[PDB]
A = this chain, B = another copy of it.
Amino acid sequence: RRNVKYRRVQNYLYNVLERPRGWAFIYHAFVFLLVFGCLILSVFSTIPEHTKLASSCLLILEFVMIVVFGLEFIIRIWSAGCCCRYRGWQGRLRFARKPFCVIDTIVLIASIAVVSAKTQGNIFATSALRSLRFLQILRMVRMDRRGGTWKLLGSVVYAHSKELITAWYIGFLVLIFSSFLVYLVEKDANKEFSTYADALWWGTITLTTIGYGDKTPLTWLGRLLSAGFALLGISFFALPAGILGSGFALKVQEQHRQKHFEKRRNPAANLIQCVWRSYAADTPPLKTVIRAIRIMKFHVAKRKFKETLRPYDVKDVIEQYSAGHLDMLCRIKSLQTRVDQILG
């Protein structure tokens, strides 16, 4: 019973750590807050008036973070043995060779060295701690598995590359032209439109709707031109956010519809059954022939799985309809051929 409970608790910990799902996310949320708090405290340590209490709080929270993080590292290393891929000392070393595991252990060691340096309290140590207080963000970086956020953003951006390039190109042209016209009408009356660089800064601040107010047109012709070009360029500069948001929402809807279905179940069952038959396969030459046939079927099932790796889409339903229509049509052709042979 001891082995069963050991493996069950190991699997539960490996689940809550490496493959979060549902309430497990709670834990990660907690750790995120912790990291975030540290960052905030670091930001509050750069303010000369608040540096004292912020530094003390950062020391206490740095200790707490060290304890909790090392505990998490040890628990993750232990729970890596839930799956036999990382079982044993060799398997644990293979787990420790993962890039994010090595990133976590160097972050831990850097934090330990930071604590030791603060205990020493040297000037070079103080500069090193000020520089290395930023390393904690790497943990937050580790959260998205294999850069999922970056991959999703890149996929959506690349899908809409032409539209984004169009929006930015026309917005840049509008910016240049509007800045030049406002510069021409505002040269002599406004001292903040002395050069074209000033007008370009004003146009960038205006068409982005930032509106600092450090530069503003004072002449009425300048204000009319600013209003018209503001309407145009403001419409143009907000375009990328709308394009990307609508693309994200459409992708989410498509993923929901796709997930709703299920495709790889049959190829997975075929792979499992052919693997089982090949495993059970081992005159004796005829038995070896059967083994080869089973391995051949295994390779076919593997290729079918590989080709079904692609998710469902409109072409899949279209070709399913085509297959059904062709089957019906050919079967009715055979039926009427038989019926006319009967009549003939």
Contacts and interface: CB of A to CB of B under 8 A. Distances in A.
A148 B170 CA distance: 12
Contacts of A200: 43
Contacts of A327: 329
A95 B149 CA distance: 46
A47 to B, nearest CB: 5
Contacts of A231: 168, 208, 237
A123 interface: no
A185 to B, nearest CB: 14
A256 B159 contact: yes
Contact of A211 (B48, B211, B328): B211
A340 B339 CA distance: 9
Interface stretch (A61-69, A83-91, A104-112, A312-320): A312-320
Identical copies in the complex: 4
Given A238-B241, A325-B324, A335-B339, A44 B220 contact: yes
A318 B316 CA distance: 12
A271 B126 CA distance: 77
A99 interface: no
**Chief secondary structure at chain A's binding surface:** helix
Interface string A243-286: 11111111111101100110000000000000000000000000
A142 interface: no
Contacts of A10: none
Interface in A167-188: 168-170, 176
A291 interface: no
B160 A315 contact: no
Contacts of A243: 245, 248-249
A213 interface: yes
